[PDB]
């Protein structure tokens, strides 16, 4: 069966685990849990293709490490998540991008940008700038809430279409 190896990366606390769990299990997590790493597997249908998602939900560490590399290198496609009320998480997207490219030894890795917590108001990152970032990188941008579920299938199913097209 067609498997798609996805990895969800980004700064600590931006909602990588809430997005993934909302995908795997269709509910919202709201507890304090410093992920290390953990992988989810679910068979879903995408554009008529029955396939398997193999999702690696990483830690938001402040330090680079080979161990992280060891986990990351298996991924096919990366979901690069920030929170729209956390400016630092948005600046960090450049560093993830760079880290992903170095780890996959490639200049064109399937990747999508996500701005999570769209339910929360008084945002600190305007959509226009984030859309522009993605476009200067050549990749799609999706906005999302692990809370309302808005955009969550779009962000993930979208990364799959980037995997299929590279």
Ligand X SMILES: Nc1nc2c(ncn2[C@@H]2O[C@H](COP(=O)(O)OP(=O)(O)OP(=O)(O)O)[C@@H](O)[C@H]2O)c(=O)[nH]1
Ligand Y SMILES: *CC(=O)N(C)CCN(C)c1ccc([N+](=O)[O-])c2nonc12
Binding site for Mg ion (CB under 5 A): 16-17, 35, 108
- Nearest-approach distance from CB 16 to Mg ion, in angstroms: 5
Q: Which residue has the tokens 């939900």?
A: 57
Q: Are 111 and 44 in contact (CB under 8 A)?
A: no
What distance in Å separates the CA atoms of residue 112 and residue 160, rounded to the nearest whole number? 10
- Nearest-approach distance from CB 16 to ligand X, in angstroms: 4
- Residue 14 in the binding site for ligand X (CB under 6 A): yes
Choose between 120 and 122: whose C-beta lies nearer to Mg ion: 120
Q: Which of 32, 11, 146, 29 is nearest to 89 (CA)?
A: 11
Piece of 48-56, 62-70, 114-122, 132-140 that binds ligand X (CB under 6 A): 114-122
* Cα angle, residue 155 at apex, residues 45 and 96 outer, rounded to 5°: 130
Give me the residues that bind ligand X (CB under 6 A), please: 12-18, 29-30, 33-35, 59-60, 116-117, 119-120, 145-147
């Amino acid at each position: 069966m067609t498997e798609y190896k996805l990895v969800v990366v980004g700064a600590g606390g931006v909602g990588k685990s809430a997005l993934t769990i909302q995908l795997i299990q269709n509910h919202f997590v709201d507890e304090c849990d410093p992920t290390i790493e953990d992988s989810y597997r679910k068979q879903v249908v995408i554009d008529g293709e029955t396939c398997l998602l193999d999702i690696l939900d990483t830690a938001g560490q402040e330090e680079y490490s080979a161990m992280r590399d060891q986990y990351m290198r298996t991924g096919e496609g990366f979901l690069c998540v920030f929170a729209i009320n956390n400016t630092k998480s948005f600046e960090d997207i450049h560093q993830y991008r760079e880290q992903i490219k170095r780890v996959k030894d490639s200049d064109d890795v399937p990747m999508v940008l996500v701005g999570n917590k769209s339910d929360l108001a008084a945002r600190t990152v305007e959509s226009r700038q984030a859309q522009d970032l993605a476009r200067s990188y050549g990749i799609p941008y999706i906005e999302t809430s692990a809370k309302t579920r808005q955009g969550v299938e779009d962000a993930f199913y979208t990364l799959v279409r980037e995997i299929r097209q590279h």
